[PDB]
């Protein structure tokens, strides 16, 4: 505490990792943790520093989100993870515990020592007698150094009996195969020592190549020295939670900061085995502690996740970024990844929604925020129900034309609403240090307009927070309903008539002479400005303040509109041949040709509609429609031998066919199966119609004739769903559209 012995230096931090987790001598209420920073100076010189924090049990329970956890379990898992020779995949048993642990330790470190940030200058003050960082402050001393990268390529060959995979899959009928491979490897660790491996690392100064026939013996091919990539350091500490002196052995990288790996073929087991060998090799001589060995990813859950990553929580000490290749914007992708890593402190996406606020504090904040609002808004919030209709007076099939139609949008309203509402309710927080979390969120919003990565992060993040607590859902629904009602009321006096939408984006019709073109461009702008001002005033009325001022955008002007359902709609402009289509499913490469055909046929029919002809026109229209379908089928004949063209995508929450046993013999192709599964259908005999997972077999394939009638019928149903509505709406008919597939062109594929 004394300031007469504190030594101050100016440096920068590039990574924070977890080193040790233990329990003090005589206490069962809390535990202690020891963390390790890798800092750099103003010209580029690595150094290692250590800090220690203490965590209670109430905070741990709050971050977990339930009351079925204990400090004993945390300590037991942390102690077990220290030995990777026998237990290398500890976080696969229970991931939520590790997520809560990481989040709580980070928050405690931020609150106790002080404010910290990555890739920014800082002033660090330490105690010379004990050797632990004691204070951190933010200052400015110049243009800090620039990050550096290093390319990595690894390949491993592991062998596992297909019977184990089959049994594990049978245990859980809807599990992904990467998790099955990981679990099988976990059961018998020794199989990770007999694998054959190859590694190639390219840096800006050297190169490192290795080829092991078996990971337990000397390399068969070698190039480079280990004493160049990294440096081994020994430090002597003296924490307050131990009775005797302690020593720590760490690795310090040389001339780089993080690894970058292409996403063409990424496999976790290769990295796990390589790092396991390094951990075993380095920590052999007795006389020092050992770090933890933990990792995280989307393959540690039974059903996977939609966004891939690879999070490192302990050994060795630096992050790894997996970026899909074959994209002309690879540099942009890597820049976005680095920016996201720096901005959010590295927790995202590992922790999830705990980077903002703990999941056991939301209800109080939501209640306090809602308690103020305004009487009418409170009444609206109390009665909110998902399936309700307020403003959007149209219906199933209906056509408008020729008039001036317009489409407007508010870009990014939910995130702004959440930020403002959380700020309003923050007065109810039972802590003065949680605001930092909210602060982070605010920054993201201000960066959304000019940075795509911020927009993607917010889009992925808001649904998680909403799903955490339904009170947020209700509050947002009520506020949005009030906004929509005000919008409609104001728009009812500028020659505007709302025809569709929900409030975030909508479309409507204007009342003006349909001939003059130089006078129809002076009424849309006035309406847009008036609506913007009215919405701003209504929001400001209910003591709600926004960082970014509202801005409403016009997305096009058309003349014809057709609506055939509650989510499908077609707009057309009869002066430049521009059009827009919304509400068509797309689950494969053969669902785009149908969209193109639909667009062309609709354009032709609506162009012919301006012939001012009696009911005969309808008959003519029908003819055209049929013709289009005919051509489509004929065109599909030439692509009858393509397997990937006809394959369709399936998600974990739907029902699919059983997995054929042979698929379990694929090997290393089962690692990249996070979320989707692609399936095709073939006929090997008579009427069998068996399924095939395309992506689990080596290329090229050898299959019987494809099944084209099934897929063609599936597409044709959706094709007709729109033509029927167009016919019933434009001409007020009563006959459905039906195409005789079974009696006209079914002989081609028989």
């Amino acid at each position: 505490m004394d300031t007469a012995d504190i030594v101050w230096v100016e440096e920068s931090v590039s990574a924070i990792t977890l080193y040790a987790v233990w329990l003090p001598p005589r206490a069962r209420e809390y535990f202690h943790a020891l963390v390790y920073f890798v800092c750099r100076n103003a010209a580029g010189e690595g150094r290692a520093r250590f800090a220690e924090v203490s965590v209670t049990a109430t905070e741990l329970r709050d971050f977990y989100g339930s009351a079925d956890v204990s400090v004993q379990a945390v300590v037991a898992a942390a102690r077990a993870a220290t030995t990777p020779a026998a237990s290398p995949l500890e976080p696969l048993e229970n991931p939520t515990l590790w997520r809560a642990l990481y989040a709580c330790v980070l928050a405690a470190l931020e609150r106790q020592t002080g404010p910290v940030a990555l890739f920014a200058p800082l002033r660090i003050g330490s105690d010379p007698r004990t050797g632990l960082v004691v204070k951190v402050e933010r200052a400015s001393w110049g243009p800090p150094a620039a990050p550096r990268a290093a390319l990595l390529v690894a390949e491993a060959n592991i062998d596992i009996d297909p019977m184990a995979l089959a049994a594990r899959v049978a245990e859980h009928p809807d599990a992904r195969l990467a998790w099955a491979r990981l679990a099988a490897i976990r059961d018998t660790p020794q199989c990770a020592s007999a694998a054959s491996l190859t590694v190639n690392i390219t840096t800006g100064t050297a190169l490192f190549a290795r080829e092991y026939q078996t990971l337990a013996f000397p390399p068969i091919k070698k190039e480079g020295a280990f004493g160049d990539l990294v440096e081994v350091c020994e430090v002597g500490l003296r924490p307050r939670g131990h009775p005797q002196r302690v020593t720590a052995r760490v690795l310090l990288p040389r001339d780089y900061d993080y690894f970058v790996s292409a996403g063409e073929k990424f496999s976790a087991p290769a990295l796990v085995a390589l790092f396991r060998q390094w951990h075993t090799t380095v920590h052999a001589a007795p006389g020092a502690l050992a770090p933890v060995f933990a990792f995280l990813g989307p393959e540690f859950e039974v059903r996977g996740g939609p966004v891939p990553y690879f999070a490192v929580l302990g050994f060795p000490g630096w992050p790894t970024f997996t970026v899909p290749a074959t994209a002309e914007s690879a540099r942009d992708l890597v820049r976005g990844a680095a920016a996201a890593y720096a901005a959010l402190l590295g927790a995202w996406p590992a922790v999830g929604a705990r980077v903002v606020l703990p999941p056991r504090a939301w209800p109080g904040v939501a209640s306090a925020a809602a308690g103020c609002l305004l009487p009418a808004v409170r009444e609206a919030v109390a009665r909110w129900h998902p399936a309700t209709k307020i403003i959007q007076l149209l219906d199933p099939p209906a056509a408008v034309g020729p008039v001036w139609t317009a489409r407007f949008c508010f870009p990014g309203l939910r995130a702004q609403l959440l930020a403002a509402l959380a700020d309003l309710g923050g007065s109810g927080l039972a802590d003065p240090h949680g605001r930092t979390g909210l602060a982070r969120l605010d920054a993201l919003v201000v960066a959304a307009p000019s940075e795509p990565w911020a927009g993607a992060v917010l889009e992925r993040l808001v649904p998680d927070t909403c799903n955490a607590c339904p009170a947020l859902r209700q509050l947002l629904g009520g506020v949005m309903a009030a906004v929509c009602l005000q919008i409609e009321e104001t728009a009812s006096s500028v020659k505007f008539a709302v025809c569709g939408g929900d409030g975030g984006a909508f479309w409507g019709v204007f009342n003006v002479d349909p001939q003059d073109a130089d006078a129809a461009s002076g009424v849309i702008e006035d309406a847009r400005r008036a609506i913007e001002t009215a919405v701003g005033a209504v929001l400001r009325a209910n003591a709600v303040r926004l960082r970014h001022p509202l801005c409403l955008a016009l997305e096009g002007v058309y003349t014809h509109a057709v609506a055939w359902s509650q989510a499908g709609v077609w707009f057309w402009n009869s002066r430049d041949n521009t059009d827009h289509l919304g509400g068509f499913p797309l689950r494969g490469p053969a669902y785009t040709t149908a969209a193109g055909v639909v667009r062309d046929t609709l354009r032709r029919v609506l162009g012919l509609t301006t012939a001012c002809v009696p009911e005969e026109d309808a008959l003519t229209a029908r003819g055209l429609m049929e013709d289009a379908c005919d051509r489509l089928i004929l065109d599909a004949f030439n692509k009858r031998l393509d397997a990937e063209y006809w394959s369709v995508r399936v998600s974990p929450f739907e029902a699919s066919d059983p997995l054929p046993p042979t698929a379990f013999r694929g090997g290393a192709l089962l690692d990249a199966e996070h979320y989707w599964r692609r399936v095709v259908r073939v006929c090997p005999g008579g009427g069998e119609s068996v399924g095939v997972p395309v992506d689990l077999y080596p290329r090229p394939l050898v299959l019987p004739p494809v099944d084209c009638a099934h897929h063609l019928r599936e597409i044709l149903r959706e094709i007709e769903l729109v033509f029927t509505g167009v016919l019933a709406g434009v001409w007020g008919e009563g006959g459905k559209f039906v195409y005789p597939f079974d009696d006209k062109m079914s002989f081609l594929f028989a």
């Binding site: 031998l641 090997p684 077999y697 090229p700 019987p704």
Partner: protein, 96 residues
């Protein structure tokens, strides 16, 4: 026209024959061997059943009308690109 009729060179005189001729039983053996060869790349299995087996199930008909159907389906399968068709696994030649 090309995908629904014999190949141009099938019905043309040649010095000798280049096919597979056999009895019924040895034909079953060769068919099983070829199917085993082809399975590892996508071809679905067969899973047959015969009287006197441990599982009665359906399709009691033994290997009497079950050979012609399989032979015909194998012979009517076309080829894509430079990869020889499937029948080459039974005739044992890469020029059919």
């Amino acid at each position: 026209l090309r995908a629904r009729t014999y190949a141009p060179g099938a019905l043309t005189p040649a010095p000798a024959y280049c096919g597979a001729v056999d009895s019924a039983t040895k034909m079953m053996g060769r068919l099983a061997d070829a199917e085993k060869l082809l399975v590892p790349r996508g071809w679905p299995a067969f899973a047959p059943a015969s009287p006197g087996e441990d599982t009665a199930g359906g399709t009691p008909p033994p290997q009497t009308c079950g050979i012609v159907k399989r032979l015909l389906r194998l012979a009517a399968t076309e080829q894509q690109g430079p990869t020889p068709p499937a029948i080459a696994a039974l005739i044992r030649n890469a020029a059919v």
